Ligand binder design. Structure first.
Ligand code: HEM
Ligand code: HEM
Lengths: 145, 146
């Protein structure tokens, strides 16, 4: 059901935000830690691993949006998901963490994006792709049945 | 202490004896497990081959842990990987106490299957150490690298 205009809303804003990714990712993380400071204990500033992770969140969320247009479902490489599941299960990432991060995602997009690009339609588009990505990763963080 | 030649020989020799009744062995093994901790069943009755396949892996990999602890200073990635094992047991919610119950059940099952003549405090220790060290390696990939 994810439309072209939905996929487009994600892609066109990404196109703009990836021009300042390093600071984008930093804002992304400062916001996560402001809501839930305890989540800093999972990692261990300009930490380039933090940059890489933030960008991963954004890039794969764009890919899930692409994949929701096409197959109407997240079609990420099965071994990438399984790996994803295991890493996040390994570091103790629970539902709460995925949610706070999704919330921080939307607020970081708002803050960083030109005011004239932000809307309810775009909010929802990023919220859907991100949720569907999280659902798939969660699926590999539990027994398959 | 220090898994050397003697401890290996005890495990290998005993395993060569028990191997002959391995089907009945593994079933008895996990029945004890479920008897001590019934809640453990929900992570996966006598007739289920997937249960037997699992009990076999425990015995066999413990036996292999024995050979590598002696030959290389520690347990190894042979038949699958530590990271794979870590990730599977994590994904099914297996805690320290589950590993421990299974080890107790292991030694209990070995003592029941072996000739009384072969059982000893030293034999007990050899299997306990090789199992303890395998579990330790597995748990290492159920957490982040310190
Ligand atoms: C859908 C959202 C997310 C995506 C796409 C994502 C993606 C990734 C990727 C690609 C890795 C690299 C590890 C590997 O090669 O498997 C990773 C690692 C990690 N993620 Fe996530 N992640 C997400 C959400 C989260 C959340 C919500 C948390 C916790 C608040 C989190 C915590 C971690 C931790 C602690 C690591 C390990 C450290 C590292 O690789 O540098 N992730 N994530
Ligand atoms: C050192 C001891 C043990 C060894 C060597 C071992 C080994 C294995 C192996 C080889 C697998 C197959 C999947 C894979 O390749 O990752 C597996 C699966 C599994 N193990 Fe263990 N395991 C051990 C202890 C335990 C304990 C204590 C429990 C729980 C009481 C347990 C529960 C499970 C479960 C639930 C699965 C998944 C089975 C399925 O999906 O049908 N294991 N184990």
């Amino acid at each position: 059901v994810f439309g072209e205009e939905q996929e487009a809303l994600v892609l066109k804003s990404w196109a703009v935000m990836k021009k300042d990714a390093a600071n984008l990712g930093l804002r992304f993380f400062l916001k996560v830690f402001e809501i839930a400071p305890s989540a800093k204990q999972m990692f261990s500033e300009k930490n380039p691993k933090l940059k890489t992770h933030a960008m991963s969140v954004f890039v794969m969320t764009c890919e899930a949006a692409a994949q929701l247009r096409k197959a109407g479902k997240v079609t990420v490489r099965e071994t990438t998901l399984k790996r994803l599941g295991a890493t996040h299960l390994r570091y103790g990432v629970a539902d709460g963490h995925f949610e706070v991060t999704g919330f921080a995602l939307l607020e970081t997009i708002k803050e960083a994006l030109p005011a004239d690009m932000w809307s309810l339609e775009m909010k929802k588009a990023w919220a859907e792709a991100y949720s569907q990505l999280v659902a798939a990763i969660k699926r590999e963080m539990k027994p398959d049945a």
